[PDB]
Design a protein around this ligand. Structure first.
Ligand SMILES: NC(=O)c1ccc[n+]([C@@H]2O[C@H](COP(=O)([O-])OP(=O)(O)OC[C@H]3O[C@@H](n4cnc5c(N)ncnc54)[C@H](O)[C@@H]3O)[C@@H](O)[C@H]2O)c1
Ligand SMILES: NC(=O)c1ccc[n+]([C@@H]2O[C@H](COP(=O)([O-])OP(=O)(O)OC[C@H]3O[C@@H](n4cnc5c(N)ncnc54)[C@H](O)[C@@H]3O)[C@@H](O)[C@H]2O)c1
Ligand SMILES: NC(=O)c1ccc[n+]([C@@H]2O[C@H](COP(=O)([O-])OP(=O)(O)OC[C@H]3O[C@@H](n4cnc5c(N)ncnc54)[C@H](O)[C@@H]3O)[C@@H](O)[C@H]2O)c1
Ligand SMILES: NC(=O)c1ccc[n+]([C@@H]2O[C@H](COP(=O)([O-])OP(=O)(O)OC[C@H]3O[C@@H](n4cnc5c(N)ncnc54)[C@H](O)[C@@H]3O)[C@@H](O)[C@H]2O)c1
Ligand SMILES: CCCCCCc1ccc(Oc2ccc([N+](=O)[O-])cc2)c(O)c1
Ligand SMILES: CCCCCCc1ccc(Oc2ccc([N+](=O)[O-])cc2)c(O)c1
Ligand SMILES: CCCCCCc1ccc(Oc2ccc([N+](=O)[O-])cc2)c(O)c1
Ligand SMILES: CCCCCCc1ccc(Oc2ccc([N+](=O)[O-])cc2)c(O)c1
Lengths: 257, 257, 257, 257
């Protein structure tokens, strides 16, 4: 496959509906060797089962709020892998208050801090901690959403954090690019995952994108996964600092009128 | 003038080269009544002199790192003004390490936190604290830079924070807009201010913009000030959620080839 | 006013609902001297009445399909004015077939040709013909629509032509900018004009923008006019190659979900 | 390969440095069946040799200035293929005057007409003529350049035409998407092809992109080809109305300062 030989670390695989699950499945199909992170002891058994499905026993804890766990992740990983070819950052979090209702009602200094720390800072933080073991043709991928670009109701503080995340893709690309490392994001359309499940208005967004996107259909983790595998691969060696929409074209219309 | 009657609070007026000085001068010319903030006791005399130049004795301390000072600012201001028509956010800060050299070399969780707290969070934080006294046709303005949109060497962590700031303009515009309040940014070209003065490569940026911008000249605080006054005024009542470039057109070219 | 002394030629003033009427009214208020173009003998009396309302008897025919009429326009104008400070291009046309229904159903080589000739080519064509008499601080303004940026149903071939028009703003800005001439567009929200009146779905667009824009209201020719006058003025001397949205913020949201 | 079974028609393969050659080579590798167009009798032998290299004898004349040749192309092709799965539009032209020197010096109504007719109109014109035989999962791809987005010296009238081309990608995506057909562009970085060879400043652009792009290297037709094959494939079934940069990240920086 077009990732033969490539060693790829994936964060964010929480259930079999996770975007990271789709990316894992496509990377394994194309020949990559995988490793996984998880957060919290109670998920160790579950992520171990997913790793095994993808032919791997490489699982490591990493809460990206914690500098020591980010350093320990790569210290552990390096006892197995000489080098790392791919990193998938599929991590987002804001306190519930901050993505419900009115933007200002949910705004506090701490809600802002936490949303930007986990959803944006953690991507270049993982990149920096990985760099000593990154291969020269490595590829780093994160997941963003259209709320970075345009204001979407309720996304609120997460939209600010995703805009900072997309900017980090560009500054990472410059930092890491003379070495040869590529950095990109997929701006994925709405997909019913665990994270999406806490958003009251999510059903309405899904209906709206189905009715108004050019392809008149919502995207799947298989579609996001295949685009992810492409970006992580040498097929995409001309592509860096890009935010690729995988959203049935929804970003490119004015819908619903 | 086209701001007659309007009461406008300006942050960030540090010296007579500050962008906020240019905006102050243009707003006063067009008829507004002004008030000012400062940070740190040693600047009280200086900002009092600037306020007096603009016919005002309304000066208030406000370090935007501190929730209590943000609340105290508007509690003080309201003992003078029933209502507020304009707010100018002209505040930026990152630790020096984070805007020098390589992006990852200057990246730490705390540098990221501080840059986003002061340069991005503080704008919607001031808006929220102001809201109880905002007039229905009020106008809020912040200052951004092209480094939000594209990666510029050394701007680094500030570019992430300005991307979050520009997103806050859009989410603020939606939050405050049913009331009638407008929210915009000016993406200003390079101007030799105190903040610019700590950037070793700033002379080179200024030369590059002079040689390659469409107007073949750098912008002034008078030009940024006039565009600011326009956005704060009822002339701009159709304009919200906008990031207006005031940069001699530099953002719109590929220069230097 | 802030256009005192400025001599401004306005195209596209067809009725008192025209965007060019709003721009005319704001420019006259701010002190400019005006001149006007029209298309077709039967409109000479009407445009003469509008010119007189704005204190001017300067009216000239100009169908922008015709090179000879574009040259004759400036030859005539120069017998009155030594120099020209402002040009407002408020001209759009596509054959009806090309802005109804499905994009491909309305697509033909000739419909494409005509839409791009009148709606896009004519702006830099007028600029070139004006250049010998442009003042060094002159300002050229055109009108665009969000359909240039994103696909909007029915706008179809006009969306292609407006994207070429917005690109012409950038290339004009570079061509004319060393002289000191600025070039900008306003991307106006929907306004019920004669041109809008032939679009069956226009009522629905107006309702949608009223419900979903940040300011929860449609824009007026007074709002577009005031932003136009600003851009044509020395207040905006730092601004060129810009496409300014004057659309109640609608461009910056995802609406209707 | 990931295009097994797919039948793809490629325009624009002029020499073995053509972008269309790279796309052809990658599509054949991934399993597609190919067909080719050419312009002008003297190139029939050459394109026949290229087709044979890709295991095909399917070659057809098509000058996209001529409606009859566009119709005859698909009438011919359909005698071989029941259905068409991919179309590569890799066609650009402007008169030499219009891409040299100053934008206005090279501007005439006819130069504008020709540049937009060949470089922009022809893409949706081919799509429309193909539609009766397009498969429901077909994929249409065109090639654009950063000069659509920002003004680049000398690109001039081609930049307007590429902006109209990128808009056609969005309107095509909506027109064709309910059927299931995807439409995208690659915005390719500079590559030394025959078309590039007539541009005096091209060496300087290539040097500038090598020095300033994030990956500090120019792109190849292999890189553009691999990204093209991806977009033409079912791997990219979530992606439509997208303009993908394949340019070593150059679009995302401000370079050369
Ligand atoms: N699902 C959608 O519609 C959609 C659309 C666009 C983008 N995104 C983004 O895709 C990414 C993946 O989310 P998903 O939808 O697949 O949901 P998910 O719930 O399957 O995955 C979210 C992941 O974030 C991880 N996470 C949260 N806090 C973390 C921390 N402190 N440390 C380490 N990991 C942490 C979770 O453990 C979980 O694995 C997120 O960045 C999300 O913002 C989701
Ligand atoms: N000067 C430029 O080239 C340029 C270009 C674009 C944008 N900007 C932005 O313009 C704004 C104004 O900067 P300037 O160039 O006029 O420089 P300046 O040095 O005159 O003003 C910077 C201001 O930030 C204030 N500030 C910093 N930390 C603060 C805190 N904790 N609390 C309250 N105020 C704080 C300072 O007191 C000072 O007044 C900043 O947002 C900057 O990012 C500057
Ligand atoms: N009304 C809207 O919602 C809206 C929104 C955005 C942009 N625009 C743009 O604003 C501009 C003004 O349109 P308007 O809405 O004020 O409508 P309008 O009908 O008042 O003005 C359209 C003008 O185009 C002129 N025109 C058409 N063909 C011409 C030719 N061959 N030669 C010279 N003039 C020609 C007409 O004479 C008329 O004056 C157009 O470019 C339009 O695309 C309109
Ligand atoms: N080479 C670059 O740096 C570069 C960068 C970006 C984009 N592009 C675009 O890539 C595309 C391919 O160009 P290329 O660089 O591979 O150059 P090329 O010279 O190899 O191909 C240009 C093709 O355009 C075709 N063409 C021109 N007029 C035509 C007509 N009337 N009918 C049918 N075909 C016609 C030519 O026959 C030729 O095959 C063009 O759209 C170009 O604008 C090129
Ligand atoms: C709220 C607006 C609708 C968003 C729809 C698409 C989407 C879905 C899930 C997304 O992922 C998350 C992850 C975490 C959290 N949260 O902890 O607050 C929220 C969202 C998202 O980014 C994006
Ligand atoms: C470093 C790249 C060049 C930037 C040029 C334009 C510019 C100048 C000053 C700018 O303002 C600041 C304010 C504070 C700090 N800092 O404390 O780190 C840095 C910058 C700016 O945003 C933007
Ligand atoms: C069709 C989609 C809705 C568009 C709404 C906003 C708008 C209104 C009027 C607009 O102006 C015109 C001018 C001419 C022609 N026409 O002759 O085909 C069409 C439009 C417009 O650009 C833009
Ligand atoms: C002139 C500015 C530099 C452009 C560099 C990248 C580039 C190279 C080749 C490109 O392709 C063409 C095709 C045809 C013609 N012409 O006939 O005038 C011109 C260009 C291009 O689009 C884009």
């Amino acid at each position: 496959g077009f990732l033969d030989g490539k060693r790829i670390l994936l964060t964010g695989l929480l259930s079999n509906r996770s975007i990271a699950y789709g990316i894992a499945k496509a990377c394994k199909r194309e020949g990559a060797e995988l490793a996984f992170t998880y957060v919290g002891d109670r998920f160790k058994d579950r992520i171990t089962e997913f790793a095994a499905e993808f032919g791997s026993e490489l699982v490591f804890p990493c809460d990206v709020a914690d500098d020591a766990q980010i350093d320990a992740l790569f210290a552990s990983l390096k006892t197995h892998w000489d080098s790392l070819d791919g990193l998938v950052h599929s991590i987002g979090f804001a306190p519930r208050e901050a993505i419900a209702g009115d933007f200002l009602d949910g705004l506090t200094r701490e809600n802002f801090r936490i949303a930007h720390d986990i959803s944006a800072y953690s991507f270049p933080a993982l990149a920096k901690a990985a760099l000593p073991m990154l291969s020269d043709d490595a590829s780093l991928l994160t997941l963003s959403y259209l709320g970075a670009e345009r204001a979407i109701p309720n996304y609120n503080t997460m939209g600010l954090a995703k805009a900072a995340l997309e900017a980090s893709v560009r500054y990472l690309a410059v930092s890491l690019g003379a070495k040869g490392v590529r950095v990109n994001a997929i701006s994925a359309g709405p997909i019913k995952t665990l994270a999406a499940s806490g958003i009251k208005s999510f059903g309405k967004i899904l209906d709206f994108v189905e009715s108004n996107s050019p392809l008149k259909r919502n995207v799947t983790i298989e579609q996001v996964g295949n685009a992810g595998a492409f970006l992580l691969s040498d097929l995409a060696s001309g592509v860096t600092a890009e935010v690729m929409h995988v959203d049935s074209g929804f970003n490119a219309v004015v819908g619903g009128m």
